[PDB]
């Protein structure tokens, strides 16, 4: 429920020693958290959004160029000369033309000639700044429970139900706890300041397209820009990228508008985030959070609860999902008020021994008297196996068997570290809970690790990483004590790693 | 006391410049921002822009940028609204008031506001009519 | 350019009467709000800075609130030299944009 066959959800089994897990949410995937008691929660990030902007530098392209001056003189007058150069509105360059008898008036020789365009803009970037104060995520909290085949569709009375929450979280107020009515009240303590390295990001505006860029890429553009002023003449700074000023072979200097320039830039922003505008709020669809997470009160709010009497009937084929669990929908006719759902996951009809790890702890209808519709979620063993009620004759009983063995799973498990390590490495270490001298420990070596690597490998492309791991990887072949070949090796193999993790 | 006061009328041609004064009493002059807010007969209040006679320097309004410039006067303690390219839809009546945590340039959005936000200071207006 | 719509466009009532007047922004101005009261090409009487906040010299009449973007002004008595065109203001993200007007009428 909000975490249904999502492909990128992570569900942490346990919090122990003092209820108290912290977690990694994205936008890219969700976490479902459940324990021995205090029912499973699905915990999201969903909207990044930026609420006031602040303007760094604009960036014309689309130029038009008119009033083209031009003024020479005599090879030893001076320099060259218009008015116009006094406006600052207009281009200005000072080539050497010849000059004679058949040029005009001079002794002969090479006379100076500058030629001068009107430079006006029309499309330009707005180049709005991020800080990272100003900022509100949100996170929808879900119970799994008495819910069924959610996951959106109407969301404003799904958030007054006890199963929703959403949670604005801000680095004004932090740390926020949200009321699941009869569940109990989840807190988490996030920090929104250490999110994405914030204030190194502009928000970047295009036309009705938004990026999110380094302020080490903006700054370096080769294009004319505006800066903050906002006044008049926008006095364009560089306006020479834009224009080329092209003479003939001696004689005149003409301009040259060099044109649209709006998809070579879409070609250069080759490693942007997209993002998308609210009015006035910058809505990023990425990026991630790092949470700790008080599981302190929670209520499973169905432990004095009854056992349903009969009719059970499941109406929607168990669809597995990936890899994940059975989820499994079912629906009582005939029942007489909130009673617990019987549910289990069995190898035979032998004392039924259930083996599952059912992740949709202590569940419960509503009341309905009439087709309520849940939705459960089981582990099965790798093997054959059946999903069992255990409660009435002729129960419901469905047979079941998986693909893949354990190993097979530690190894998926492995690879999906290794996702985790690839993006966001240097909180990676903190998806995992509680961690004495072995998870803080960790995370301080792979952040001393990860700081020098980023310290001298940054303009690393992906076809960059791939050629200088190719390298290396050779060079751990090479000449001798073993150590430094085995540094260059394992560095090699670390780019080459980080390289195939992205794209593959 | 804490004032600000205007020239007299004008009245100008299309395509002209007309210049209206805004000088201060009563306060320390190089620590108000001084807010230029235009009014239509017809029509409600419209921001113009925003000077501060500290160091001069100026913003305004998206419907005005390159019409409008803004000067000072510390010695007299003046403040010089130029609005240039005049039209039919220039004739109104301007108004020029404070607005405090005016300590070093530009706006001071985030930080502190109200108390005259630029309420107090306005004093008589100035009517600029535009037409031949 | 926060657009700031400004209901109702204009009232009357009598002397000692209670009155709203709500102002909506587009976007979230949390407590960046203001309001004017001008008579006709004068110099105006002072109402609210800061969305709910009296200055000193106003008479206590006037009160304002709102916290979300939702703004209502209030006039609890009603007097004859209360007559003029009711005015709000934003604060935030500078292109400050005022309401539209709310006049009054003695009846």
């Known amino acids: 429920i909000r975490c249904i066959g999502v492909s990128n959800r992570d569900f942490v089994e346990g919090m122990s020693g003092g209820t108290w897990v912290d977690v990694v949410l994205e936008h890219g995937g969700c976490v479902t958290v459940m324990a021995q008691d205090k029912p499973t929660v699905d915990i999201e990030l969903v909207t990044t959004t930026v609420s006031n902007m602040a303007e760094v530098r604009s960036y014309c392209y689309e130029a038009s160029i008119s009033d083209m001056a031009s003024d020479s003189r005599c090879p030893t007058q001076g320099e060259a000369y218009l008015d116009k150069q006094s406006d600052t509105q207009y281009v200005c360059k000072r080539t050497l033309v010849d000059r004679g008898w058949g040029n005009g008036c001079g002794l002969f020789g090479k006379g100076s000639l500058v030629t001068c365009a009107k430079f006006a803009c029309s499309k330009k970037m707005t180049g709005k700044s991020i800080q990272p104060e100003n900022l509100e995520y949100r996170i929808m909290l879900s119970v799994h429970g008495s819910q069924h085949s959610g996951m959106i569709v109407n969301d404003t009375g799904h958030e007054t139900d006890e199963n929703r929450a959403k949670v604005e979280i801000t680095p004004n107020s932090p740390r926020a706890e949200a009321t699941l009515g009869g569940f109990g009240s989840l807190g988490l303590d996030c920090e929104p300041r250490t999110g994405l390295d914030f204030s190194d990001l502009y928000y970047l505006t295009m036309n009705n397209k938004h990026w999110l860029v380094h302020k080490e890429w903006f700054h370096d553009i080769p294009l004319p820009w505006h800066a903050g002023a906002d006044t008049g003449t926008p006095h364009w700074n560089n306006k020479e990228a834009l224009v080329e000023f092209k003479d003939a072979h001696a004689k005149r200097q003409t301009v040259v508008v060099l044109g649209s320039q709006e998809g070579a830039v879409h070609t250069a922003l080759a490693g942007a985030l997209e993002a998308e505008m609210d009015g006035a709020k910058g809505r990023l669809s990425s990026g991630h959070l790092k949470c700790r997470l008080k599981m302190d009160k929670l209520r499973l709010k169905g432990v004095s609860y009854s056992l349903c009497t009969a009719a059970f009937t499941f109406t929607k084929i168990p669809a597995e999902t990936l890899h994940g669990t059975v989820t499994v929908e079912v629906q009582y006719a005939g029942t007489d008020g909130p009673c617990k759902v019987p549910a289990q996951m069995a190898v035979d009809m032998q004392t039924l021994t259930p083996v599952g790890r059912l992740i949709t702890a202590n569940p419960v209808i509503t009341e309905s008297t009439e087709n309520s519709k849940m939705m459960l979620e089981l582990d099965p063993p790798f093997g054959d196996s059946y999903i069992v009620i255990g409660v009435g004759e002729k129960k419901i009983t469905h047979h079941w068997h998986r693909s893949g063995s354990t190993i097979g799973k530690a190894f998926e498990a492995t690879v999906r570290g290794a996702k985790r390590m690839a993006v966001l490495g240097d909180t990676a270490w903190d998806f995992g809970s509680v961690g004495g001298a072995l998870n803080s420990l960790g995370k301080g070596i792979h952040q001393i690790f990860g700081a020098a690597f980023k310290s001298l490998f940054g303009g690393m492309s992906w076809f960059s990483q791939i050629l200088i791991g190719t390298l290396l990887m050779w060079l751990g072949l090479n000449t001798k004590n073993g150590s430094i070949s085995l540094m260059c090796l394992a560095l090699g193999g670390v780019l080459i790693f980080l390289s195939t993790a992205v794209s593959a | 006391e804490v004032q600000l006061v205007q020239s007299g009328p004008d009245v100008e041609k299309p395509g002209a410049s007309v210049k209206v004064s805004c000088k201060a009493s009563?306060?320390?002059?190089?620590?108000?921002?001084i807010h230029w807010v235009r009014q239509a007969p017809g029509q409600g209040l419209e921001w113009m822009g925003v000077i501060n006679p500290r160091g001069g320097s100026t913003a305004s309004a998206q419907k005005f940028q390159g019409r409008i410039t803004m000067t000072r006067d510390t010695s007299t303690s003046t403040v010089y609204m130029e609005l240039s390219s005049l039209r039919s839809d220039d004739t109104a009546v301007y108004y020029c008031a404070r607005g405090g945590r005016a300590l070093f340039y530009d706006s001071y959005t985030t930080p502190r506001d109200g108390g005259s936000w630029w309420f107090d200071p306005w004093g008589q207006g100035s009517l600029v009519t535009v037409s031949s | 350019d926060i657009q700031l719509t400004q209901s109702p466009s204009s009232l009357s009532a009598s002397v000692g009467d209670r009155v709203t007047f709500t102002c909506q922004a587009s976007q979230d101005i949390r407590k960046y709000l203001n309001w004017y009261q001008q008579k006709p090409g004068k110099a105006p009487k002072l109402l609210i800075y800061?969305?709910?906040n009296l200055k000193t010299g106003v008479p206590s009449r006037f009160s304002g609130s709102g916290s979300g973007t939702d703004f209502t002004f209030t006039i609890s008595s009603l007097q004859p030299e209360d007559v003029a065109t009711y005015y709000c203001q934003q604060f935030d993200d500078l292109p400050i944009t005022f309401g539209q007007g709310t006049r009054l009428q003695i009846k």
């Open positions: 800061d969305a709910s």
């Open positions: 009563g306060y320390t002059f190089t620590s108000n921002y």
